[PDB]
Design a protein around this nucleic acid. Sequence first.
DNA 1: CTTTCCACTTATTC
DNA 2: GACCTTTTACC
DNA 3: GGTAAAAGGTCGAAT
DNA 4: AAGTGGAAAG
Length: 295
Amino acid sequence: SINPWILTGFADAEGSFLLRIRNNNKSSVGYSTELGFQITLHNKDKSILENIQSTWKVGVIANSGDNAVSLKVTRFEDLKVIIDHFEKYPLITQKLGDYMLFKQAFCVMENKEHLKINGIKELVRIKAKLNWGLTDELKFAFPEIISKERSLINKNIPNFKWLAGFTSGEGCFFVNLIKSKSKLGVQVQLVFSITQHIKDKNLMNSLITYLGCGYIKEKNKSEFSWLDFVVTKFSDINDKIIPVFQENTLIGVKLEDFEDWCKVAKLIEEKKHLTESGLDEIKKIKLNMNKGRVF
DNA sequence: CTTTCCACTTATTC
DNA sequence: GACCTTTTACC
DNA sequence: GGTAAAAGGTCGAAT
DNA sequence: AAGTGGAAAG
Ligand SMILES: [Mg+2]
Ligand SMILES: [Mg+2]
Ligand SMILES: [Mg+2]
Ligand SMILES: [Mg+2]
Ligand SMILES: [Mg+2]
Ligand SMILES: [Mg+2]
Protein backbone atom coordinates (compact mmCIF):
# COMPACT_ATOMS: atom_id res chain seq x y z
CA SER A 1 0.00 0.00 0.00
CA ILE A 2 1.12 3.54 -0.80
CA ASN A 3 1.48 5.92 2.16
CA PRO A 4 -1.59 8.21 2.29
CA TRP A 5 0.51 11.39 2.50
CA ILE A 6 2.72 10.28 -0.38
CA LEU A 7 -0.50 9.57 -2.28
CA THR A 8 -1.86 13.08 -1.64
CA GLY A 9 1.46 14.59 -2.71
CA PHE A 10 1.36 12.59 -5.94
CA ALA A 11 -2.28 13.60 -6.42
CA ASP A 12 -1.35 17.26 -5.90
CA ALA A 13 1.20 16.73 -8.68
CA GLU A 14 -0.68 14.57 -11.19
CA GLY A 15 -4.33 14.17 -10.22
CA SER A 16 -7.46 15.81 -11.58
CA PHE A 17 -11.17 16.02 -10.81
CA LEU A 18 -13.79 15.78 -13.54
CA LEU A 19 -17.39 16.84 -13.91
CA ARG A 20 -19.08 15.95 -17.18
CA ILE A 21 -22.38 17.63 -17.95
CA ARG A 22 -23.39 16.19 -21.31
CA ASN A 23 -26.29 16.92 -23.64
CA ASN A 24 -28.41 13.78 -23.46
CA ASN A 25 -31.71 13.47 -25.34
CA LYS A 26 -32.72 10.46 -23.24
CA SER A 27 -32.28 12.25 -19.91
CA SER A 28 -35.32 13.79 -18.22
CA VAL A 29 -33.60 17.17 -17.86
CA GLY A 30 -31.79 16.77 -21.18
CA TYR A 31 -28.46 16.43 -19.41
CA SER A 32 -26.58 13.45 -17.99
CA THR A 33 -23.69 13.78 -15.55
CA GLU A 34 -20.49 12.03 -14.53
CA LEU A 35 -18.33 12.89 -11.53
CA GLY A 36 -14.85 11.62 -10.81
CA PHE A 37 -11.16 11.67 -10.04
CA GLN A 38 -8.40 10.55 -12.40
CA ILE A 39 -4.66 10.19 -12.88
CA THR A 40 -3.12 9.66 -16.32
CA LEU A 41 0.55 8.63 -16.44
CA HIS A 42 3.12 7.35 -18.91
CA ASN A 43 2.90 3.56 -19.35
CA LYS A 44 6.18 3.07 -17.48
CA ASP A 45 4.49 4.07 -14.23
CA LYS A 46 1.43 1.83 -14.58
CA SER A 47 2.57 0.17 -11.35
CA ILE A 48 1.82 3.40 -9.47
CA LEU A 49 -1.80 3.39 -10.64
CA GLU A 50 -2.13 -0.30 -9.75
CA ASN A 51 -0.82 0.42 -6.25
CA ILE A 52 -3.25 3.32 -5.83
CA GLN A 53 -6.07 1.11 -7.10
CA SER A 54 -5.00 -1.59 -4.64
CA THR A 55 -4.79 0.90 -1.76
CA TRP A 56 -8.16 2.58 -2.34
CA LYS A 57 -9.87 -0.61 -3.59
CA VAL A 58 -11.62 1.54 -6.22
CA GLY A 59 -11.11 2.84 -9.74
CA VAL A 60 -10.64 1.49 -13.24
CA ILE A 61 -7.34 1.24 -15.12
CA ALA A 62 -7.38 1.57 -18.91
CA ASN A 63 -5.13 2.59 -21.80
CA SER A 64 -5.03 6.29 -22.66
CA GLY A 65 -3.58 6.10 -26.14
CA ASP A 66 -0.55 3.95 -26.93
CA ASN A 67 1.91 5.62 -24.55
CA ALA A 68 -0.23 6.45 -21.51
CA VAL A 69 -2.48 4.76 -18.96
CA SER A 70 -5.22 6.12 -16.72
CA LEU A 71 -6.80 5.36 -13.38
CA LYS A 72 -10.36 6.69 -13.27
CA VAL A 73 -12.87 6.62 -10.42
CA THR A 74 -16.38 7.67 -11.46
CA ARG A 75 -18.58 5.04 -9.78
CA PHE A 76 -20.60 7.14 -7.37
CA GLU A 77 -20.36 5.01 -4.21
CA ASP A 78 -16.61 4.65 -4.80
CA LEU A 79 -16.25 8.44 -4.73
CA LYS A 80 -16.84 8.25 -0.97
CA VAL A 81 -13.43 6.59 -0.69
CA ILE A 82 -11.93 9.54 -2.57
CA ILE A 83 -13.66 12.02 -0.28
CA ASP A 84 -12.59 10.07 2.81
CA HIS A 85 -8.93 10.20 1.77
CA PHE A 86 -8.76 13.90 0.93
CA GLU A 87 -10.72 14.91 4.02
CA LYS A 88 -8.09 13.16 6.13
CA TYR A 89 -5.01 13.88 4.00
CA PRO A 90 -5.82 17.20 2.26
CA LEU A 91 -4.28 18.62 -0.92
CA ILE A 92 -2.29 21.85 -0.59
CA THR A 93 -1.87 23.13 -4.17
CA GLN A 94 -4.59 25.07 -6.00
CA LYS A 95 -6.01 21.62 -6.79
CA LEU A 96 -7.54 21.72 -3.30
CA GLY A 97 -10.03 24.19 -4.75
CA ASP A 98 -10.90 21.67 -7.44
CA TYR A 99 -11.43 19.01 -4.79
CA MET A 100 -13.78 21.29 -2.86
CA LEU A 101 -15.84 21.76 -6.02
CA PHE A 102 -15.81 18.00 -6.62
CA LYS A 103 -17.18 17.60 -3.09
CA GLN A 104 -19.94 20.13 -3.76
CA ALA A 105 -20.98 18.29 -6.91
CA PHE A 106 -21.02 15.00 -4.97
CA CYS A 107 -23.50 16.47 -2.49
CA VAL A 108 -25.81 17.59 -5.30
CA MET A 109 -25.74 14.15 -6.91
CA GLU A 110 -26.09 12.31 -3.59
CA ASN A 111 -29.47 13.99 -3.06
CA LYS A 112 -30.34 13.12 -6.68
CA GLU A 113 -30.77 16.85 -7.37
CA HIS A 114 -28.89 16.48 -10.67
CA LEU A 115 -31.96 14.73 -12.11
CA LYS A 116 -33.86 18.01 -11.78
CA ILE A 117 -33.10 21.23 -13.67
CA ASN A 118 -32.17 23.19 -10.54
CA GLY A 119 -29.54 20.60 -9.68
CA ILE A 120 -28.12 20.79 -13.20
CA LYS A 121 -27.86 24.59 -13.01
CA GLU A 122 -26.09 24.25 -9.65
CA LEU A 123 -23.70 21.73 -11.19
CA VAL A 124 -23.02 24.15 -14.04
CA ARG A 125 -22.22 26.84 -11.46
CA ILE A 126 -19.79 24.41 -9.85
CA LYS A 127 -18.22 23.38 -13.16
CA ALA A 128 -17.66 27.03 -14.12
CA LYS A 129 -14.98 27.23 -11.44
CA LEU A 130 -13.61 23.74 -12.10
CA ASN A 131 -10.46 23.36 -14.22
CA TRP A 132 -10.96 25.00 -17.61
CA GLY A 133 -14.48 26.12 -16.72
CA LEU A 134 -17.61 25.83 -18.86
CA THR A 135 -17.73 24.71 -22.48
CA ASP A 136 -19.07 26.91 -25.28
CA GLU A 137 -22.33 24.96 -25.44
CA LEU A 138 -22.84 25.20 -21.67
CA LYS A 139 -22.14 28.94 -21.77
CA PHE A 140 -24.73 29.26 -24.53
CA ALA A 141 -27.29 27.16 -22.65
CA PHE A 142 -26.65 28.87 -19.31
CA PRO A 143 -25.68 32.51 -20.01
CA GLU A 144 -26.59 33.60 -16.46
CA ILE A 145 -23.66 31.55 -15.15
CA ILE A 146 -20.76 33.98 -14.96
CA SER A 147 -17.05 33.13 -14.87
CA LYS A 148 -15.99 34.37 -11.44
CA GLU A 149 -12.35 34.18 -10.41
CA ARG A 150 -11.52 31.55 -7.79
CA SER A 151 -9.99 32.43 -4.44
CA LEU A 152 -6.34 31.54 -3.89
CA ILE A 153 -5.50 28.41 -1.90
CA ASN A 154 -2.66 29.00 0.56
CA LYS A 155 -1.55 25.91 2.48
CA ASN A 156 1.79 24.86 3.97
CA ILE A 157 3.67 21.64 3.21
CA PRO A 158 2.32 19.20 5.82
CA ASN A 159 5.37 16.88 5.98
CA PHE A 160 8.20 15.24 4.02
CA LYS A 161 5.94 12.35 2.97
CA TRP A 162 3.78 14.74 0.96
CA LEU A 163 6.97 16.17 -0.54
CA ALA A 164 8.14 12.70 -1.61
CA GLY A 165 4.83 12.18 -3.41
CA PHE A 166 4.96 15.61 -5.03
CA THR A 167 8.60 15.17 -6.07
CA SER A 168 7.82 11.72 -7.46
CA GLY A 169 5.48 13.57 -9.81
CA GLU A 170 7.28 16.84 -10.59
CA GLY A 171 10.92 16.44 -9.57
CA CYS A 172 14.06 15.94 -11.63
CA PHE A 173 17.36 14.43 -10.54
CA PHE A 174 19.90 15.58 -13.10
CA VAL A 175 23.62 15.05 -13.70
CA ASN A 176 24.99 18.07 -15.55
CA LEU A 177 28.28 17.47 -17.38
CA ILE A 178 29.80 20.89 -17.92
CA LYS A 179 32.63 21.57 -20.37
CA SER A 180 35.31 23.03 -18.11
CA LYS A 181 38.82 24.47 -18.12
CA SER A 182 39.69 21.91 -15.44
CA LYS A 183 42.19 19.05 -15.69
CA LEU A 184 39.63 16.50 -16.90
CA GLY A 185 37.88 19.12 -19.02
CA VAL A 186 34.52 18.18 -17.53
CA GLN A 187 32.80 19.51 -14.41
CA VAL A 188 30.21 17.25 -12.77
CA GLN A 189 27.25 19.19 -11.38
CA LEU A 190 24.30 17.55 -9.64
CA VAL A 191 21.02 19.43 -10.01
CA PHE A 192 17.79 18.90 -8.08
CA SER A 193 14.67 20.62 -9.36
CA ILE A 194 10.90 20.86 -8.92
CA THR A 195 8.65 22.55 -11.49
CA GLN A 196 5.21 24.11 -10.98
CA HIS A 197 2.77 26.60 -12.53
CA ILE A 198 3.07 30.15 -11.12
CA LYS A 199 -0.42 29.83 -9.60
CA ASP A 200 1.35 28.10 -6.70
CA LYS A 201 4.20 30.58 -6.36
CA ASN A 202 3.75 30.68 -2.57
CA LEU A 203 4.20 26.93 -2.23
CA MET A 204 7.28 26.96 -4.48
CA ASN A 205 8.89 29.82 -2.55
CA SER A 206 8.32 27.95 0.72
CA LEU A 207 10.54 25.12 -0.56
CA ILE A 208 13.58 27.34 0.03
CA THR A 209 12.81 27.60 3.74
CA TYR A 210 11.30 24.12 4.06
CA LEU A 211 14.42 22.44 2.67
CA GLY A 212 16.90 25.07 3.85
CA CYS A 213 18.46 25.47 0.41
CA GLY A 214 17.90 26.31 -3.25
CA TYR A 215 16.55 29.14 -5.38
CA ILE A 216 13.66 29.91 -7.75
CA LYS A 217 13.95 30.30 -11.52
CA GLU A 218 11.14 32.08 -13.37
CA LYS A 219 10.52 30.44 -16.75
CA ASN A 220 8.15 31.10 -19.63
CA LYS A 221 7.06 29.77 -23.02
CA SER A 222 4.90 32.00 -25.22
CA GLU A 223 2.16 33.31 -22.90
CA PHE A 224 2.62 30.53 -20.33
CA SER A 225 4.69 30.92 -17.16
CA TRP A 226 5.96 28.54 -14.49
CA LEU A 227 8.53 28.27 -11.70
CA ASP A 228 11.51 26.02 -11.08
CA PHE A 229 12.87 25.35 -7.60
CA VAL A 230 16.54 24.50 -8.16
CA VAL A 231 19.42 23.25 -5.99
CA THR A 232 22.98 23.20 -7.36
CA LYS A 233 25.19 23.51 -4.26
CA PHE A 234 26.57 20.04 -3.60
CA SER A 235 26.73 20.25 0.20
CA ASP A 236 23.02 21.08 0.18
CA ILE A 237 22.27 18.25 -2.24
CA ASN A 238 24.31 15.77 -0.23
CA ASP A 239 23.35 16.83 3.31
CA LYS A 240 19.78 18.04 2.82
CA ILE A 241 18.08 16.84 -0.37
CA ILE A 242 19.40 13.27 -0.47
CA PRO A 243 18.65 12.46 3.20
CA VAL A 244 15.05 13.66 2.78
CA PHE A 245 14.28 11.21 -0.01
CA GLN A 246 16.38 8.47 1.55
CA GLU A 247 14.04 8.64 4.55
CA ASN A 248 10.92 9.32 2.48
CA THR A 249 10.99 6.90 -0.43
CA LEU A 250 9.99 8.11 -3.89
CA ILE A 251 7.60 6.12 -6.08
CA GLY A 252 7.66 5.15 -9.75
CA VAL A 253 10.54 5.00 -12.21
CA LYS A 254 11.88 8.27 -10.74
CA LEU A 255 12.98 6.28 -7.68
CA GLU A 256 15.54 4.50 -9.87
CA ASP A 257 16.74 7.84 -11.24
CA PHE A 258 17.15 9.19 -7.71
CA GLU A 259 19.21 6.15 -6.73
CA ASP A 260 21.51 6.53 -9.75
CA TRP A 261 21.79 10.21 -8.83
CA CYS A 262 22.92 9.22 -5.33
CA LYS A 263 25.58 6.95 -6.83
CA VAL A 264 27.10 10.02 -8.46
CA ALA A 265 26.79 12.03 -5.24
CA LYS A 266 28.76 9.33 -3.43
CA LEU A 267 31.53 9.55 -6.04
CA ILE A 268 31.58 13.35 -5.75
CA GLU A 269 31.72 13.10 -1.96
CA GLU A 270 34.74 10.81 -2.28
CA LYS A 271 36.30 13.25 -4.79
CA LYS A 272 36.34 10.45 -7.38
CA HIS A 273 34.64 12.76 -9.88
CA LEU A 274 38.05 14.40 -10.28
CA THR A 275 39.60 11.13 -11.48
CA GLU A 276 39.43 9.57 -14.95
CA SER A 277 37.98 6.34 -13.56
CA GLY A 278 35.29 8.13 -11.57
CA LEU A 279 34.33 10.44 -14.42
CA ASP A 280 34.02 7.40 -16.69
CA GLU A 281 31.61 5.72 -14.29
CA ILE A 282 29.58 8.92 -13.93
CA LYS A 283 29.24 9.28 -17.71
CA LYS A 284 27.94 5.70 -17.92
CA ILE A 285 25.46 6.31 -15.09
CA LYS A 286 24.15 9.47 -16.77
CA LEU A 287 23.61 7.63 -20.07
CA ASN A 288 21.32 5.06 -18.43
CA MET A 289 19.22 7.38 -16.26
CA ASN A 290 16.20 9.59 -16.94
CA LYS A 291 15.53 9.81 -20.69
CA GLY A 292 18.40 7.38 -21.29
CA ARG A 293 16.61 4.54 -19.50
CA VAL A 294 15.20 1.79 -21.55
CA PHE A 295 12.01 -0.14 -20.90
C1' DC B 1 -33.44 6.90 -18.04
C1' DT B 2 -29.27 6.72 -15.63
C1' DT B 3 -24.89 4.90 -14.43
C1' DT B 4 -20.49 3.14 -15.71
C1' DC B 5 -16.71 2.12 -18.49
C1' DC B 6 -13.99 1.97 -22.76
C1' DA B 7 -11.55 4.19 -26.72
C1' DC B 8 -9.37 8.17 -27.95
C1' DT B 9 -7.78 13.22 -28.72
C1' DT B 10 -5.83 17.67 -27.53
C1' DA B 11 -3.56 21.59 -24.91
C1' DT B 12 0.17 22.76 -21.89
C1' DT B 13 2.63 22.14 -17.53
C1' DC B 14 5.97 19.94 -16.63
C1' DG C 1 10.99 17.66 -16.68
C1' DA C 2 15.21 16.54 -18.94
C1' DC C 3 18.44 18.70 -21.09
C1' DC C 4 22.08 22.11 -22.65
C1' DT C 5 26.08 26.02 -22.83
C1' DT C 6 27.87 30.10 -20.94
C1' DT C 7 28.98 32.83 -17.13
C1' DT C 8 30.23 33.93 -12.51
C1' DA C 9 31.83 32.88 -7.82
C1' DC C 10 35.27 30.97 -4.87
C1' DC C 11 40.10 30.12 -2.67
C1' DG D 1 44.40 28.26 -12.09
C1' DG D 2 41.55 25.12 -11.06
C1' DT D 3 37.11 23.84 -9.30
C1' DA D 4 32.24 24.79 -7.88
C1' DA D 5 27.88 27.34 -8.35
C1' DA D 6 24.79 29.98 -10.73
C1' DA D 7 22.76 31.95 -14.73
C1' DG D 8 19.73 31.58 -18.51
C1' DG D 9 17.79 29.39 -20.94
C1' DT D 10 15.34 25.34 -24.91
C1' DC D 11 11.76 22.16 -26.33
C1' DG D 12 9.62 17.60 -26.48
C1' DA D 13 6.10 15.28 -24.24
C1' DA D 14 3.79 13.43 -19.87
C1' DT D 15 0.46 15.20 -17.67
C1' DA E 1 -4.13 17.11 -17.24
C1' DA E 2 -8.34 17.86 -19.31
C1' DG E 3 -11.49 16.80 -22.48
C1' DT E 4 -14.93 14.10 -26.20
C1' DG E 5 -17.87 10.36 -28.37
C1' DG E 6 -19.88 5.93 -27.93
C1' DA E 7 -22.63 2.31 -25.96
C1' DA E 8 -23.57 -1.70 -22.84
C1' DA E 9 -26.49 -2.72 -19.04
C1' DG E 10 -30.84 -3.24 -16.09
MG1 LIG F 1 1.46 18.85 -11.78
MG1 LIG G 1 5.09 13.31 -13.42
MG1 LIG H 1 0.37 19.62 -19.07
MG1 LIG I 1 1.04 19.00 -15.31
MG1 LIG J 1 9.81 12.07 -17.26
MG1 LIG K 1 5.50 15.07 -16.62
